[PDB]
Amino acid sequence: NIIAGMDLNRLDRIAEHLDRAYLHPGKLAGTMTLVARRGEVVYCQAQGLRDVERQLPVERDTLFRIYSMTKPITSIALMQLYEQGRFLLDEPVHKYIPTWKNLRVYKTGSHPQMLTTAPQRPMTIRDLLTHQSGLTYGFMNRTNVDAAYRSLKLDGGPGHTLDRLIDELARLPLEFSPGTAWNYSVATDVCGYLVQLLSGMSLDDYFSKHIFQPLGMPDTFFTVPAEKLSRFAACYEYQPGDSFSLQDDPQGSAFAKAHGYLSGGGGLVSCVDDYYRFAQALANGGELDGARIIGRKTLEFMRMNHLPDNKGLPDVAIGSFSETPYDGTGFGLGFSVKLDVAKSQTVGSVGEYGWGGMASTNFFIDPEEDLLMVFMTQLIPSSTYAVRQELRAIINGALVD
Amino acid sequence: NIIAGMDLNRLDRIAEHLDRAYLHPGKLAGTMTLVARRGEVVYCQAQGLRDVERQLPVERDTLFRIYSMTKPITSIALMQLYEQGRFLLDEPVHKYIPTWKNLRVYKTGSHPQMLTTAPQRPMTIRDLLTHQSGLTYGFMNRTNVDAAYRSLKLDGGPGHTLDRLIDELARLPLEFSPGTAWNYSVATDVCGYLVQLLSGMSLDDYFSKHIFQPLGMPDTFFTVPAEKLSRFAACYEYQPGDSFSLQDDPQGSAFAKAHGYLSGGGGLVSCVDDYYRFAQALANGGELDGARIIGRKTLEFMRMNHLPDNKGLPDVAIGSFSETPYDGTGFGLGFSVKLDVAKSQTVGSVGEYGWGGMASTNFFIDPEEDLLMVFMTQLIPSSTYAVRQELRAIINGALVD
Amino acid sequence: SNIIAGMDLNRLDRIAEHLDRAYLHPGKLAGTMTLVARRGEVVYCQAQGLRDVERQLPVERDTLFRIYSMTKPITSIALMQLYEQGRFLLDEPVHKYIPTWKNLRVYKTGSHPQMLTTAPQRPMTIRDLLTHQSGLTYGFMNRTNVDAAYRSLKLDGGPGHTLDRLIDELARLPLEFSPGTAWNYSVATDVCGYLVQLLSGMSLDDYFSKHIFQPLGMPDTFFTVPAEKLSRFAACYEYQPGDSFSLQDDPQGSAFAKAHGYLSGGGGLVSCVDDYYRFAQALANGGELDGARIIGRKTLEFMRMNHLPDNKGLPDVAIGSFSETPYDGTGFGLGFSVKLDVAKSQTVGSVGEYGWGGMASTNFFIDPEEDLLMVFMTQLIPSSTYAVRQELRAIINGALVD
Amino acid sequence: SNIIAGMDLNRLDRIAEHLDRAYLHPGKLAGTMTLVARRGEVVYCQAQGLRDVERQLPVERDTLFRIYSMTKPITSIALMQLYEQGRFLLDEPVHKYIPTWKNLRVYKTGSHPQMLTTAPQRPMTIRDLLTHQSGLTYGFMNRTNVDAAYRSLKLDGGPGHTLDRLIDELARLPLEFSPGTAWNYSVATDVCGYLVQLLSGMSLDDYFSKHIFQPLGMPDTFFTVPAEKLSRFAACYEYQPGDSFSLQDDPQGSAFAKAHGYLSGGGGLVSCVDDYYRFAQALANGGELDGARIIGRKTLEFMRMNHLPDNKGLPDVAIGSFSETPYDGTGFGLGFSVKLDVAKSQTVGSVGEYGWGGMASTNFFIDPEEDLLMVFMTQLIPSSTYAVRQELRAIINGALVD
Amino acid sequence: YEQGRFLLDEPVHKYIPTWKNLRVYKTGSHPQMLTTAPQRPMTIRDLLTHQSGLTYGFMNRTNVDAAYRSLKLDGGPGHTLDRLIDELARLPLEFSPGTAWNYSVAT
Ligand SMILES: *[PH](O)(CCCCCC)OC
Ligand SMILES: *[PH](O)(CCCCCC)OC
Ligand SMILES: *[PH](O)(CCCCCC)OC
Ligand SMILES: *[PH](O)(CCCCCC)OC
């Protein structure tokens, strides 16, 4: 039983695996898994519960916090403006954010008496899109700089806005001279701020007009509307013993409020069908059902390794993206990119691109096989289980042409 | 006379060569040689005797000790379970064999007072499939560690079982920190033990159900059944003067008994037609006559060079696989892989994969030319003559398109 | 929507929107002429703003522009036509054809005219001339005592300057470095023009006319603007602080209107978008347009290769301003730049993209992977001022919808 | 417009114009025979000037030429025919077939016959012979005490010389270096010829005739010119100062007209453009011409690969004159040079272009990317004198018009 | 040296002008030896330390010492210092002065 060169009986191992290894033993609440090849959806399965407390099951239309899977959407948004001539990647950020002209590199000291050295060159927009800015994230919990992000709540918090992020970051140091290393950052939240600066629109309006309406994604937003809140999943966090506990109730969630923070880095709620339509648009070279969000050639450029000398993340990453899963994987303008299949120790193709969210949401596009996967669950953090590698083994196992 | 772009008159040089250089001068007892291209068998020749003492000739259906040619079959078996999500290659072995958690690297001393250092990282399943474990073989005869394997008879002997191997190896050191070198090992025997752990079946039953029955291989087994023992060849060993002497009588062979040792590394008896069906299945991307043993993509992954930085065996091998014949040849998940044709000093194609047995059995698959060869003889050891390189010269010489 | 040769014409309209919003309305450029072609079809052609601000005259399709250093690919084609006839080899020493140059030496120290020199490791070759690895320089570089000597002798141009004077003066000057060991943009292409003359027996304007302009149907390309075409000749502007510009060359009163006796293979030509399009399209086709062949397919493929050592980019070998970030991942062949690494260049495009530019902000490229090309004309010195040629690449590559 | 197989025949006429203007009229060469083929079709064939100046005899299509070192590809094919029959392996030691060579040692110091030696890291292999990494040399190298010993023993050729004498004398001489660690052009191909004899049971002239010349229809290729064909045999000339030449070998009373006992796999053959064309075309086709097969398609593909370590060019490994600029970006396989990097070579052509030359300025190449080939015949020693083979490449590649 | 008559870093060709254009051996047999330019001229310090690039006939290693032997520059019938200096002016050096050491007629 074969569609688009995929054995559907082999794809049934996905549901068998998620039941046996995660759902029955109580490691995940529930899952939504979609696989497509050559434009055809060949697998779509909801399993377990979206809300354990209320015994509500996962459905095709269940809404999920996709978190950092927001970043590819923000990256597409900014590259739409690149295609209109609005900026160049090698332009300094301080051309658009002049208060950032004299950013300096951390040397020593605690906030707010941090001493700094001059950088070799100013931060560029390419540095923002590739996380080579020298910016960081509060949750990194490694350096005095991310300690300053936490005391100023730059990851989010009451009264946080993009305007406050840009203003606070102007008076903070960088982990390193821009371009000389890689560190996962609020840089994509800054990219969102640049979409606003250049388009004249707030980020929710830019996304709606130039991405969600054209692709037919009616269930993707920064704020879950009151009338759709019944469909919104609960979020769970890891507990010792391979268990989980309630982390966010859908009723009385900050995702249900219009607080003033539009996070290009982690803000969006979506569903498997909406993210599938985004992913399929990219797999097609930027077009779905006569709507174009990006040029074929612009997207090809975003999918290239933009790290120096075709290095992988572990050759440049100062932190946790140094670890064995990211071996043979580079980074472009908002996507990871597989460079070396054997080195990654995971079956796949050179050029496989995608990203993930910290609640264990994942997607990839294999341009060699014209194959893609969207996986939705709500378990923080994504570092907990290697479910996204097991799914790659089963899905690549189902190719039979 | 040309079939599948091969001149059959040029292929007749095989039989002329094996007669002139080996059979008439009494260097080999007998040979069975098969060549196929694009799904079509273009050469099949039995020559000389399977049993010199009893004057019995080699026939198409003659049974041969294929030894280390068992390893690709064991590798396919374990990768079938990879495709079901049952493990990941970068997982530690001690996750499945917990007694192995505190394995350490040899420093100095004789068994049983060997001193050890901490390894930089624990052994992984990828390390087992690629012989980068730090495990070894008794017959290596190079180090105090392989001396301990010999005094404990871990290569085989009276009362030996997979359960005993895993138990003894838990109290022995490694030649080196896992991943940091290559050394041919009992690792594939351990892979067989993991097929058992994960499937719930003994290895002979897993092979029968998931490989031999589907491919139509009724003459491949760990134990030769009583009613087929008439077809079983004698095994010969090298003697000075380019001669040979009886090493194993087929009547009263340990291969005719069900002793308790199922060797994923060296145990199987087979015939040219059965191994042809396995080889042709691989050449086709894992399918023969509607039966699938492995996914096309999973097999493509096993055929890649899994050595660090695309190095050849001589750049990482601590032992005999360091020598000139293995120049320009890497190693994947149970197969050698040609990297550089000129450097190997042997005609062929980049990507040529296969392996050999210590009784001078050999097979290869050239994925560039869709060409393959199965060669059967019984002369220990395989290091004696370069017959497998002469056959490559003749076979590649017969391509006429 | 409206698609020609796999290009969305609505997406290509962003070119005109961009040049208006970013350059013309704010008064950074006087006027622009932009042409884009793919698979032999012109898919974009737009004049905007003024060719002469003082006289309120608009840019038209037929407006004539100082293309300057975009002369160099034409001179390079001319010399490679003679390579195809067996007249020289690239690894031959220049002094075989210019014997007075046999004892050229490398700058060590001193001011003109008491410059001390060292022996070069090897003599200058013709390949060194075509790739700017000669060790020659330009007066306008303003970096070294050697380019100071070029300026005091007016070797970039000036009253009574001829190719014969350049070759004679260069014989008594030192090189910035031992030939082949570095890259420095130079009068080398002016010397290439002198070699076209030596080998063909013709003056450069006659060689270009007979062997390139007549065959390709380029009637509006010349070293001297004829009296009867001077109405069509654009003014040249130079940058002023505040992202402004001032008159640099009045068309009526221009040295480009006189036959002053310097035929510059490096910077001399005046042309128009249609003439340079026909040259560019000929190259994109492998050296042929409408049955006329200016170069062999294979000879051109050879000119488009990276001729720098060890497949290095300009910043790994360039001693000067071509060291800077825009030329990262870009090499150099026989008269063209060549893109090596798209990500490294930080600009969308294809490996193999070739072309060059003029110091008045004229630019052209040919993408052989996409069979795409662009000719961009404006008159604003210097071209280092604005990154307009990168913005145009972003918009044009953005319009591909295959 | 004459176009055959994507080649402009008007552009190919530049060959004859060039050889007249640059070589024949000025008296640098006596005469030339030039053939060019593409996709199986001969597109150029021109005799020019004289085969014998003293007797005023012109060059004809059927003129016989000393092809010298262009013998080596034929000897290489002969030995690889036996590789295909399983008779040897490339990584086997030579001393397995020539046991007297087991204790060969590397030159340290001293003059013949009191040369001191060191142990080699490994014994010489057959791959070392086919790639000139043996450590053997040639008398005419005139660089080392070892080639001085070759000259005093006349191992390049001389009265009473035979292959049997070469193998016997070489057993008592040292190597320039430990086998595999460098490249030096050598008598190694003469030794390959000796191995064709050892393995086949036939003398080399009989092996060539039966297994190469008869099958391909090459009736005018031999070690000895038969009496009835001596009228067709060209004179050989050597360079004289002033770009002139002098008689080096009279065809009447030539050693090439005698059956002396020396069958040179390295330099012995006389042939003609048509015979060498048939050999070249057989190789361009993958080892087959008009139903006759001399070598397997795959075996030939293996001979055309770079067999130097780490994909190095000749200048990265060559101890001698093949270190110089013309061999930049060129490697070496089993009897052929192989182009690696077109730009680096400074000569138009394709990656994979293979061929070789003779010391009397005979040359051939096969471009497998363009399915193009050339055979060029003249008699002017030495081939290092003029760059005619690079000029011909420029004109021939210039004639591609698809 | 102590009387101020020369300095060690002075070129030899200051005192032996025929030696100004000495060149380094590349290839060939005497008397048709091809040569390359040296990086710097031979100095008196090079003579006193055997870093000249000169050699001795008896070395029996190179084509250059073969030329010394056929010209009997180590000694023999009619040999004088005047003949050594005259013959050495027309011979190549084993290497560019200063870049190696080779025991020689330098003394
Ligand atoms: P992403 O899911 C991080 C985005 C949101 C973090 C703010 C608390 O990382 C993979
Ligand atoms: P294989 O044939 C080794 C098989 C196990 C032998 C144990 C004595 O090695 C190439
Ligand atoms: P080109 O436009 C240099 C032309 C010569 C100018 C001499 C005054 O440089 C990019
Ligand atoms: P070949 O033509 C060398 C032939 C041997 C010459 C014997 C003196 O070298 C390119």
Author numbering:
A (entry chain D), B (entry chain B): 9 to 409
C (entry chain C), D (entry chain A): 8 to 409
E (entry chain G): 90 to 196
From the paper:
Family VIII esterases present similarities to class C β‐lactamases, which show nucleophilic serines located at the S‐X‐X‐K motif instead of the G‐X‐S‐X‐G or G‐D‐S‐(L) motif shown by other carboxylesterase families. Indeed, the analysis of the substrate specificity revealed its capacity to hydrolyse nitrocefin as a model chromogenic cephalosporin substrate (40.4 ± 11.4 units·g−1), and a large battery of 66 structurally different esters (up to 1730 min−1), including bis(2‐hydroxyethyl)‐terephthalate (241.7 ± 8.5 units·g−1) and the mycotoxin T‐2 (1220 ± 52 units·g−1). It also showed acyltransferase activity through the synthesis of benzyl 3‐oxobutanoate (40.4 ± 11.4 units·g−1) from benzyl alcohol and vinyl acetoacetate.
Structural analyses of free and substrate‐bound forms of this homooctamer esterase suggest that EH7 presents a more opened and exposed S1 site having no steric hindrance for the entrance of substrates to the active site, more flexible R1, R2 and R3 regions allowing for the binding of a wide spectrum of substrates into the active site, and small residues in the conserved motif Y‐X‐X containing the catalytic Tyr enabling the entrance of large substrates. These unique structural elements in combination with docking experiments allowed us to gain valuable insights into the substrate specificity of this esterase and possible others belonging to family VIII.
